[PDB]
Assembly symmetry: C2
Homo-oligomer: 185 residues x 2
């Protein structure tokens, strides 16, 4: 919390605006702390990237879990709920979505981080191993798979945010498109 | 009359508009654009009475550039709709990699609520083979007038991600392009 949280938040805004390349100087100033302070909460830049990824994924997951209907079991309806909740989170927090999009496809995420991320929402993780095309689960292309998901979700968000009355239609269409692209027949 | 001090600056306006729209988005200022092109905001408007007119002209300018590039490489001997579409994808990707700013500007323009039906038609008519392919292979919903822009949007989002990864990890470029194509094919076409 407080000072570490201020840094996380400053990092979110800087990464969302300037991409994964954002400098700790900007981050630190924006947080209201000297850069030497930043480097005692987060040893390296990569550690910040990993910590911030986990922090954003936790915040995303928090929103999904509160309204998750654990009755439903078929892969298509569950993926649907995750998608709708992702869309809602991103429309609520455009910067957090933009940061997480840069972070997710970053080759800087460690194996431990991904592991940790997947088990914040165990059922969601179970769904991916069973539903997502194997390719988009391979340690080689999982990032690409994530990137395509996030790209289709961002377009959906963009159309829904500018036309709230038809948001429901955009969101449904985006989902069917996403489902066809990334899951198995 | 004396000799005009300089040539028509339309091309220079179109170029500066491409770069500003690609950098700041469709919300780019005409004032910034005119200054980048080396002209008063007033002479911008002598060429484009409105920002709306600029959006439409630039989109057609950019689509014409893209289409020219694809038409040359085209192989009309291919009848298979999926192999045909894979050509368009590879061509589009290759153009976007070679002109990242143009792909980014086109992507902002394509989804603009400001593009007109008429602009859409002229752009489609630039490449009849591609237009006719879309009419028969793109899912009906994404060819409708209500969701046409949304269909372009998703296609561009998958094309952008593909270029992103191919540009950052140029050694696996071929695989990213192929996988992104199969993703796009599944998302937007019939079966």
């Amino acid at each position: 919390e407080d000072k570490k949280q201020a840094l996380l938040e400053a990092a979110t805004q800087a990464i969302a605006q300037s991409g994964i390349a954002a400098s700790t100087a900007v981050i630190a100033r924006n947080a209201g702390v000297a850069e030497g302070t930043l480097f005692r909460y987060f040893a390296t830049k990569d550690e910040l990237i990993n910590t911030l990824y986990l922090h954003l994924k936790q915040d995303l997951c928090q929103s999904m879990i509160m309204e998750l209907d654990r009755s439903i079991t078929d892969a298509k309806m569950m993926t649907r709920f995750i998608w709708n909740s992702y869309i809602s989170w991103g429309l609520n927090h455009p910067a957090r979505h933009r940061a997480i999009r840069q972070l997710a496809v970053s080759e800087k995420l460690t194996k431990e981080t991904e592991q940790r991320a997947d088990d914040m929402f165990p059922e969601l993780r179970d769904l991916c191993h069973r539903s997502v095309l194997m390719v988009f689960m391979s340690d080689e292309y999982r990032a690409f798979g994530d990137g395509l998901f996030l790209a289709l979700a961002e377009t959906t968000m963009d159309f829904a945010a500018r036309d709230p009355a038809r948001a429901g239609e955009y969101i449904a269409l985006g989902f069917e498109a996403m489902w066809r692209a990334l899951t198995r027949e």
